[PDB]
């Protein structure tokens, strides 16, 4: 049970473990696209003897954070331990090796999507974005008088084949990801993947259509089994006009009873309707998880609310260092100190605060975050809060 | 079709319309309790000829708002138009008469619970609190190391008959409602009602038990039909210790598979567990709706975030006045002006901002709230935000 | 295993068999009401030794038939064989004894409601009325421009307690039953029963409300478990105005999603809406079954279509006689003959034709009704057809 | 937003709109077959600028009507407005253009199948045939003694591959459609389509088998997901012998629990069984919709009941002309008149009466059809009634 960097000879074993470990796994032809995002020495396998009983890797990602600042991000993925090799400490060993390589390579943060919500806390990962399913009963949906783009003249939205407007989607997404906390750069090979899933699979998924606006798009398909349900896989709007326009078009799908979308908690859709309740929240889950690899690098890199005035404190991260934190003019200076701590928290908790999705006051009430000054709690709450609401880019 | 204040002769007709209009309606013996909360001239009926084809009334309530400030509040309730008299403008007429009486009596705000989410916007009501159902699969629930009250020695929580500890619940609730935006004073007659529903109804609801802590309580009953489900009707905790303690006790209901509760979006429960995901959000709806009856009275009465620095603007409420608004040191001065408006919004939108449940930025993205300065949007967002998260007290 | 007329000593045994045989059975206090409709010598029991292992009885009813003609009708009911005494020929024996008494008493027809649709054919009973469940999704329901009673001024429909308007319901029903094929005289004791079921049963059925028009009524209750469903137990309208008015009022139940009613196939409701499809047919079953006890008495008593011109034929009923049938001016003369038969049918088939619910052509296509002249089939079809569509009165 | 006849360049745009608008749409290879049924100038598109935002066309059909009379029929189909271009009056404009072309080409009637039941009334379409799903629990099904084809010797029904007996199905259908109101000529290209759907689609529909009798056939497949359910897609019987024989064979599918079929309300199947109730009605919907394009041409072309004696009246169709209508010897003479109207109805209502599926008395009770003489209502009822019951041929 030795821990190694896989050779090309190990790939067959990794794809087997992958197929047995993840049901979504397409197979080794879609694995070519994602493989380009794994750097040399981004992967560990555990051999037994020999076959692969454990694997883990990270991908080179670019994550947008508050202040429209883009961080290099180790994206953890393809983590699996063989059913034959459970409770053998293989995840603890593989995670420790990758976290060393990630740290030593100069990534300030790592990120993942969680298969279960109880595994990644103990390795310093905090859920940092919230997914929110909205289901609209579109038979009752009337837009509010105040809603944009409900006047006379033409619609600026077009029904299109996705695959004939790759360039326009690319441009819109590229604007979207640079401007929104949670945004990831989506490279060419993943657009290649996305448009392959846009066409109908025999005995599988239906044709995906696209609604295209100058400043936004929505990809949608009718559900396999429920033929009165449209699933919006992805809606990217750069402007409020684009967002409203696209939803006017989705509510225009007169053959559907229900439109469903995985969105963020601050999605303005409910406020576009006369009856806010018509956009029911049907599902809520953790999206992206962050591990802050370097506390001073990460805290310094992101912007903070200009509204809160200058303040200073000492933050202790459990087995992660003690820092003099000074915030003002929406910049932070974060420097080593042995002064008495005013705030303590595990490293997972900082991940959860970092993109503004969770309030420090809420984590305080759960005692995940200790402080004796309720004024300092208010100031952290206000400082770490994000002007642009945090969204989830794409699963990896 | 004349609009009148009901006499005692009209009550029979109102109870008939009530039974035909609301399925929850107990009947005329529970109506005695609530009747004490309706002031003289708090009710209108519409007679035809004669029987009652329309009714509406308000109750004298005390609503807690940010800054632990308690407003007199007209609580709108018992609104019904006979199925025989729809689309006859009876609601518009009854609502207009009560809003006059409410305004002329010196209530700064009115409030209601909505049977449908598409009726009350046009009468100036904005949804102001969010209800959040959490269902915990308690078979998997382990508390986090950081969680309070998981040490050796005795538990401070007691399993009790609710009806033998009315005094203690009263005291705890009274502390709770004074300290939390959305809180209502609960008078004696409504405690009398609440403890009557605590005992088992033949072929109806099961016995309610109580978990009692010095600084908190939870009332729960097993669901009628699903015997592995506990429904927490009401959990009031004044301290984080009390909140965690009470949930340690609820997760200790080893004969249940699932605990369900209607709570608020900032409930710290998910953060008390090692697996945040075990507290699934199963349901989300508008709770309390506000109509701001007097804009300057209401804006001046509530506290604002101390973090945001002093700023001034002109707010226009559609057919509701234009005001010079100056906010600083968490107080607002709100005075008449004919200066050019920097923010416009319908009166319903102000209701939605008032308790801090909805961000001005979110309503802006839906164009419910117009401004050309994105800096002013950030400042409103920050100012109107509530330190103590807004909760929902009790339905009326 | 002797076959007898029950004494008062036998009642306990009959109520036991009743409770074990029919789940709807209230118990011996509701049995007092119906007992008044059973004539002396209207009941048979089978004793074993002793306890009651078999029972059957008939009630004295008045059935309206085409031409607004009212026939004395033996209503068969309370038929049960003990689970301990199946496949012992007890039903064949009890049915034969009652059919003798019914025949010898001068009833031209007997009738029943069937617990299963495969038992009563062999005893000469034919299904004669069709039940039709309509479920309206009332959220989408808009009345057609052409629909009556959608103008300005007051509604003539009232929401009422059923029990305070017994006299008005009685009068309306009495007009209804005299004018409609399938109508039964409803005696006082059954109105006493009906209004007892109008009030709420603890852990059972909800309060019944009434919609009252000068020329019609509807009794409705909200469903026990599904609180967005209204069940219309009974709607009697004497005029089209009344029928439309009452449905305008039912569609006005704005707190319900769905109105359901058991009605007849020719119910005009679908044609009152802009979208006929909103009144979905959710359920269809045989209602009232007829056994023609005396072929010439029954054929002569009912009216026939005036449209079809005079024609003559020979009808043979299998083990029921051969008759010269002459129809014209909507009267029939039916007299013994030994002339060659032109139409043969079992006695059950005549029951099915008798109220106009089933076309002779349809039963011909199934070869339940033999003839070699397709012209004679058209003439029977046209003659037996009912101008007023056949409805179902009440179960017994 | 100009309204044009599409060129071959427009087809790509029409197939896109088709795929986004109808979920059943196969794709552009099945579109070749149906395209042969669209005449030159049978289609309109609406371009925006450009892409297709609206389309509609009619197909040249031959509809059988009462009296075994075959009318040329514009079959309306492929109607779609882009989700981006709702509430823009595009359907009203496209429908008006096609109705002009249909009228000017000398079609006496147009017809369609409705995606929703609330759209086509306002364009003069009335639902003219009723679809009726019968589900048989075939485990309980015993044929009645009176049923044909239950004697000794061989069965005349064969289990066959559909595709090896195209000629025999064609011949039987051709006899069926000529003899039955609602019948459509089915051209070669649609038989080509039908037998392509008879073979198994990978991850889709199962193999279709055929039961073949000299004078009838049934196509059936086992349901994709429910393997104890047989779906009879199509059963055509020319004789009662054939109809009973084929059902004896379907009830012989001993591995199925349930046989389901979409049939007509007068289907004799229930009367072939000892228990009529075993054929439950599980579903009812409008089938074919008629717009009478020329009132005198249509009324004169169809046969009428010989049973009703000669009578004369004045019919007014709302914005459709006033006519002296004289009916006798099952022919109608229909001529212009300015005499006072005795019957008024919208044009949609005439469509509903035309094939005999709806009684004039029923539409009268809904006030869709006004007259002050109840005798004239009886005469229309009787005259328009169809000897052969009206069926639905095939969806288009
Ligand atoms: N990261 C990936 N994602 C996806 S789809 C994302 C949805 C799953 N998601 C993840 C869990 C939770 C929520 C849903 N597919 C693929 S294939 C593939 C990778 C990968 C990683 C690199 C790998 C490899 C292995 C050996 C040698 C070279 C490269 C091949
Ligand atoms: N406000 C009330 N609430 C309740 S339970 C609350 C739950 C309903 N809720 C409301 C809708 C949305 C969500 C659920 N019960 C009662 S009874 C009663 C009142 C009343 C008001 C006063 C009234 C009256 C009438 C005529 C004369 C004198 C007094 C009698
Ligand atoms: N006919 C009755 N109906 C009903 S409710 C009808 C619904 C049942 N229906 C019937 C089956 C199919 C469909 C639903 N309840 C009652 S109680 C009662 C009778 C009876 C008959 C007379 C009997 C008796 C016995 C011994 C001595 C004296 C009198 C007492
Ligand atoms: N009429 C058709 N039906 C069907 S399947 C019927 C079931 C749908 N039905 C309809 C709605 C309600 C109930 C189910 N498929 C096809 S493809 C096709 C047509 C068409 C029409 C002609 C068209 C075209 C377009 C542009 C250029 C040339 C030709 C191509
Ligand atoms: Mg975050
Ligand atoms: Mg609020
Ligand atoms: Mg009948
Ligand atoms: Mg018809
Ligand atoms: Na596509
Ligand atoms: Na998609
Ligand atoms: Na709303
Ligand atoms: Na500060
Ligand atoms: Na108790
Ligand atoms: Na409770
Ligand atoms: Na977690
Ligand atoms: Na400021
Ligand atoms: Na009542
Ligand atoms: Na009822
Ligand atoms: Na319709
Ligand atoms: Na005749
Ligand atoms: Na086959
Ligand atoms: Na088939
Ligand atoms: Na039967
Ligand atoms: Na006549």
Domain boundaries of chain C, sorted by first residue: 1-128+287-291, 129-286, 292-387
User: Which residues 6+ apart lie within 8 Å of A366 measured at CB?
Assistant: B144, B146, B147, B240, B244, B268, B270, B271, B272
Give the C-alpha separation, A372 to A174, whole Å: 43
Alpha-carbon distance C366 to nearest alpha carbon in chain D (angstroms): 5
Name the pairing type of β-strands D208-213 and B51-65: unpaired
* D123 is known as an active-site residue: no
β strands within C227-309, DSSP E: 229-237, 258-263, 279-286, 288-292
C1-128+287-291 falls under which CATH superfamily?
A: Gcn5-related N-acetyltransferase (GNAT) (3.40.630.30)
Q: Are the beta carbons of B51 and C159 separated by less than 8 Å?
A: yes
The answer to whether C221 touches C205, Cβ cutoff 8 Å, is yes
List the single residue in B17, B21, B84 with the smallest CB-CB distance to C157.
B84
Convert A255-293 to b/e letters by CB count within 10 Å (16 or more is b): bbebbbbbbbbbbbbbbbbbbbbbbbbbebbbbbbbbbb
Ligand 1 touching residue A38 (CB < 6 A): yes
Closest CA to B258 of B291, B293, B223: B223
CA separation for the pair B24, B28 (Å, rounded):
13
Closest by CA position to A114, among listed B279, B268, B276: B276
Cβ distance D198 to D209 under 8 Å? no
Which position has the token pair 């005696």? C187
Contact C355, C385 (CB under 8 A): no
> Which tokens go with C33?
């009401």
Count of Cβ atoms closer than 10 Å to residue D371 Cβ: 18
- Distance CA(C154)–CA(C145), nearest Å, equals 18
Nearest to B323 by CA among B309, B306, B339: B339
| The pairing of beta strand D288-292 with beta strand D109-113 | antiparallel
**Nearest residue to B300 (alpha-carbon basis) of B291, B292, B308:** B292
> What is the number of the ligand 1 atom nearest to the C-alpha of A37?
22
Q: Are B351 and B292 in contact (CB under 8 A)?
A: yes
**Residue C236 φ/ψ, nearest 5 degrees:** -115, 115
For tokens 């409410």, the residue is: B102
Q: Which atom of ligand 1 is nearest to the CA of A30?
A: 17
Q: In terms of CATH, what superfamily is A292-387?
A: SCP2 sterol-binding domain (3.30.1050.10)
Yes or no: say if A245 and A216 are a contact pair by the CB < 8 Å rule.
yes
Nearest CA to ligand 3 atom 19: C34
Residues of C designated as active site: 120, 396
- What is the C-alpha to C-alpha distance for residues A264 and B362, in angstroms, rounded to an integer? 12
Q: Are B94 and B44 in contact (CB under 8 A)?
A: yes
Which residues in D lie closer than 8 A to residue C277 (C-beta atoms)?
Answer: 114, 116-118, 285-286
Contact present, B and C (at least 3 Cβ pairs less than 8 Å): yes
Q: What is the Cα–Cα distance from D38 to D32, expressed in whole angstroms?
A: 10
Give D-chain residues touching A154 at CB under 8 angstroms: 1, 48
- Strand partners for B285: B131
The answer to whether residues D19 and D27 touch, using CB atoms and an 8 Å cutoff, is yes
* CA distance linking residue B231 with residue B261, whole number of Å: 6
The tokens describing B255, both together, are: 């004969």
* Nearest-by-Cβ selection for C253 from B1, B83, B116: B83
Q: Which chains touch D (3 or more CB pairs under 8 A)?
A: A, C
Q: Which CA distances in Å does A315 have to A128, A324, A337, A376, A382?
A: 19, 7, 9, 11, 16
Q: How many residues does chain C have?
A: 396
User: Concatenated DSSP letters for C319-336?
Assistant: TTEEEEEEEETTEEEEEE
The C-alpha atoms of residue C47 and residue C65 are separated, in whole angstroms, by 38
Any chains having at least 3 CB pairs less than 8 A from chain B are A, C
Contacts 24+ apart (CB under 8 A), D7-13: D10/D45, D10/D47, D10/D52, D13/D45, D13/D47, D13/D51, D13/D52
Q: Which residue has the tokens 């199934």?
A: C366
Q: Is A306's CB within 8 Å of B378's CB? A: yes
Cβ atoms of C276 and C134 within 8 Å: the answer is no
Q: Tell how far the Cα of A272 is from the centroid of ligand 9, in angstroms.
A: 28
Q: Is B48 in Cβ contact with C159 (below 8 Å)?
A: no
Chain D residues inside the 8 Å CB shell of C276: 117, 127, 286
DSSP string, D165-221: -HHHHHHHHHHHHHHSTT-B---HHHHHHHHHTTSPPTTSPPPEEEEEETTEEEEEE
Q: Which tokens hold the place of D320?
A: 């459709």
Using alpha carbons, select from D87, D30, D24, D26 the residue that is nearest to residue D54: D87
Can you tell me whether residue D31 is helix, strand or coil? Answer: helix
Contacts 24+ apart (CB under 8 A), A372-377: A372/A342, A373/A342, A376/A311, A376/A313, A376/A342, A376/A343
Rounded Cα–Cα distance for residues A313 and D334 (Å) = 96
Distance of alpha carbon B324 from alpha carbon B344, whole angstroms = 12
CATH number among 3.40.50.12280, 2.60.120.640, 3.40.50.2300, 3.40.630.30, domain B129-286? 3.40.630.30
Q: Cα separation of C307 and D383, whole Å?
A: 9
Q: How far is the CA of B388 from the centre of ligand 15 (A)?
A: 24
Active site residues of B: 120, 396
Does D90 show up as a binding residue in the annotation? Answer: yes
A157 vs D19, D84, D116: nearest CB: D84
Q: Is the dihedral of CA A299, A303, A308, A309 positive or negative?
A: positive
From its phi and psi, is residue D345 left (phi > 0), alpha (psi between -120 and 50) or beta? Answer: beta
Q: Round the CA-based radius of gyration of chain C to a whole number and report it.
A: 23
Measured between alpha carbons, how far is D326 from D313 in angstroms, rounded to an integer? 6
Method: X-ray
CA atoms of C43 and C45, how far apart (whole Å): 7
Give me the count of residues in chain A: 396
Candidates B17, B42, B156; CA nearest to B101 is: B42
Can you read off the two tokens belonging to residue C241?
């105005």
Whether the CA torsion D90, A275, C134, A225 is positive or negative: it is: positive
Q: After which residue numbers is chain C interrupted with C–N beyond 2.5 angstroms?
A: 49
Residue B49 tokens, joined:
């000829």
Contacts of C272 in chain D (CB under 8 A): 366
CA pair distance B256, B228, nearest whole angstrom:
4
Of the candidates D120, D173, D354, D384, the residue annotated as catalytic is: D120
Q: Contact A125/A351 with Cβ under 8 angstroms?
A: yes
Cα→Cα distances C96→A282, A346, B120, C122, Å: 62, 88, 67, 12
Q: How many CA atoms lie within 13 A of A224 on its CB side?
A: 8
Q: Which of A204, A215, A253 is nearest to A232 (CA)?
A: A253
Helix (H, G, I), strand (E, B) or coil at B309: coil
Read off φ and ψ for residue D157, nearest 5 degrees.
-95, 140
Provide the shortest C-alpha distance from residue C242 to chain B (in Å).
13
Q: Tokens representing A21?
A: 């470990």
CA-to-CA distance for C113 and A257, rounded, in angstroms?
40
Structure-token pair, residue C11: 């009642």
**Does D116 sit in the ligand 4 pocket, CB within 6 Å?**
no
Is residue C209 within 8 Å of C159, Cβ to Cβ?
A: yes
CA-wise closest residue to D128 among D367, D304, D317, D363: D363
Helix, strand, coil percentages in chain A from 3-state DSSP, rounded to 5? 30, 30, 40
Cite the DSSP H helix spans in B180-327: 188-196, 240-251, 269-272, 295-301
- Does the distance separating the beta carbons of C271 and D366 come in below 8 Å? yes
Tell me how close the Cα of B175 comes to any Cα of chain A, in angstroms.
Answer: 18
Q: At what angle do helices B347-354 and B374-384 cross, to 10 degrees?
A: 50
Is A328 in contact with A355 (CB distance < 8 Å)? no
C75 in Cβ contact with C98 (< 8 Å): no
Query: Please, how many CA atoms are within 13 Å of residue B370, restricted to the half-sphere of its CB?
Result: 12
Nearest to D366 by CA among A331, C210, C247, C382: C247
* Touch criterion met for B and D (3+ Cβ pairs within 8 Å): no
> Inter-chain contact C389–D281, Cβ cutoff 8 Å?
no
Q: Return the partners of chain A (3 or more C-beta pairs < 8 Å).
A: B, D
Give the span between the Cα atoms of D169 and D175, in whole angstroms: 10
| Cα of D22 to nearest chain C Cα, Å | 19
Contact C159 B16 (CB under 8 A): yes
B22, B77, B125: residue to mutate for ligand 2 pocket, most atoms within 8 A of CB = B77
Spell out where chain A is interrupted, by the residue before each break (C to N > 2.5 A): 49
The reply to whether domains C1-128+287-291 and C129-286 share a CATH topology is: yes
Which residues have a Cβ under 8 Å from the Cβ of B86 and sit 6 or more positions away?
C252, C254
| Contact status, residue D232 vs residue D267, Cβ threshold 8 Å | no
B118/A275 Cβ within 8 A: yes
What secondary structure letter does DSSP report for B351? H
Residue D49: partners with Cβ closer than 8 Å, 6 or more residues away: none
CA distance readout (Å), C375 to C326, C380, D268, D286: 15, 9, 19, 30
Q: State residue A297 phi and psi, 5-degree precision.
A: -60, -50
Question: Starting at the edge strand that comes first in sequence, how are the strands of the sheet with A369-370 ordered?
Answer: A331-336, A321-328, A311-317, A343-345, A369-370
Q: Is C113 in the pocket of ligand 3 (CB under 6 A)?
A: yes
List, edge to edge, every strand of the sheet that includes D321-328.
Answer: D331-336, D321-328, D311-317, D343-345, D369-370
CA C257 to chain CA mean position, Å: 29
Q: Which positions ≥6 away from A350 have C-beta within 8 Å?
A: A126, A292, A295, A298, A317, A320
Place of tokens 């090692």: B274
Q: Label residues C93-106 b or e (16+ Cβ within 10 Å = b).
A: bbbeebbebbeeee
Dig out the tokens for D388 from the structure.
């052969």
Q: Is C207 helix (H, G, I), strand (E, B) or coil?
A: coil
Is B77 close to ligand 2, i.e. is its CB under 6 Å away?
yes
Are D84 and A252 an interchain contact pair (Cβ–Cβ within 8 Å)?
Answer: yes
Distance of CA C346 to the CA centre of its chain: 21
- The answer to whether residues D306 and D330 touch, using CB atoms and an 8 Å cutoff, is yes
Q: Where are the strands (E) in chain C, listed by range?
A: 2-4, 43-48, 51-65, 69-81, 109-113, 126-127, 130-137, 158-160, 208-213, 216-222, 229-237, 258-263, 279-286, 288-292, 311-317, 321-328, 331-336, 343-345, 369-370
- Sheet containing C43-48: give its strands across: C2-4, C43-48, C51-65, C69-81, C109-113, C288-292, C126-127
Give the separation between CA A236 and CA A243, rounded to whole angstroms: 8
- Which SS3 state, helix, strand or coil, does residue B57 take? strand
Catalytic residues of A: 120, 396
Ligand 1, pocket-test mutation among A11, A58, A75, A78, most atoms within 8 A of CB: A78
B116 is in an annotated binding site: yes
Q: Which helix (H) or strand (E) holds A174?
A: helix A166-179
Q: Is D79 annotated as a binding residue?
A: yes
- Report chain A residues whose CB lies below 8 A from the CB of D85: 155, 252
Q: Are strands C109-113 and C69-81 parallel, antiparallel or unpaired?
A: parallel
Instruction: Using only the alpha carbons of chain A, give its radius of gyration.
Output: 23
């Amino acid at each position: 049970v030795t821990l190694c960097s896989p050779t090309e000879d190990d790939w067959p074993g990794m794809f087997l473990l992958a197929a047995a470990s993840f049901t979504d796994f397409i197979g080794p032809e879609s694995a070519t696209a994602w493989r380009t995002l794994v750097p040399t020495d981004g992967a560990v396998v555990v051999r037994d003897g020999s076959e692969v009983v454990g694997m883990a890797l990270y991908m080179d990602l670019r994550l947008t954070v508050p202040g429209e600042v883009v961080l290099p991000t180790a994206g953890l993925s393809f983590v699996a331990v063989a059913p034959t090799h459970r409770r053998r400490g293989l995840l603890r060993a593989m995670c420790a090796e990758l976290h060393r390589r990630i740290a030593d390579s100069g990534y300030p943060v790592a990120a993942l999507h969680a298969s279960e919500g109880g595994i990644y806390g103990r390795f310093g990962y905090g859920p940092a974005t919230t997914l929110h399913e909205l289901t609209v009963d579109r038979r009752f949906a009337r837009f509010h008088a105040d809603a944009p783009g409900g006047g006379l003249g033409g619609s600026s939205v077009r029904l299109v084949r996705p695959t004939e407007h790759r360039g326009e989607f690319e441009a819109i997404y590229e604007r979207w990801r640079q401007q929104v906390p949670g945004g990831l750069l989506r490279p060419q090979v993943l657009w290649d993947e996305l448009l392959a899933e846009a066409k109908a699979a025999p005995g599988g998924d239906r044709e995906s259509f696209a609604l295209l606006h100058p400043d936004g798009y929505a990809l949608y398909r009718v559900d396999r089994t429920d033929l009165k349900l449209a699933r919006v896989s992805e809606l990217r709007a750069v402007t409020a006009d684009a967002h409203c326009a696209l939803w006017r078009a989705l509510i225009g799908l007169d053959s559907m009873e229900r439109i469903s979308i995985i969105t963020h908690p601050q999605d303005p859709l409910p406020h576009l309707l006369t009856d806010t309740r018509l956009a029911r929240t049907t599902w809520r889950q953790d999206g992206l998880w962050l591990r802050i690899m370097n506390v001073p690098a990460a805290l310094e890199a992101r912007g903070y609310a200009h509204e809160v005035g200058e303040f200073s404190t000492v933050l202790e991260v459990s087995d992660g260092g003690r820092f003099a934190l000074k915030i003002g003019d929406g910049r932070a200076r974060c420097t080593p100190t042995d002064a008495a701590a005013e705030i303590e928290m595990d490293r997972d908790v900082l991940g959860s605060l970092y993109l503004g999705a969770h309030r420090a006051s809420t984590l305080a009430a759960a005692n995940r975050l200790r402080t004796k000054d309720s004024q300092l709690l208010r100031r952290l709450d206000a400082a770490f809060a994000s002007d642009v609401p945090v969204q989830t880019a794409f699963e990896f």
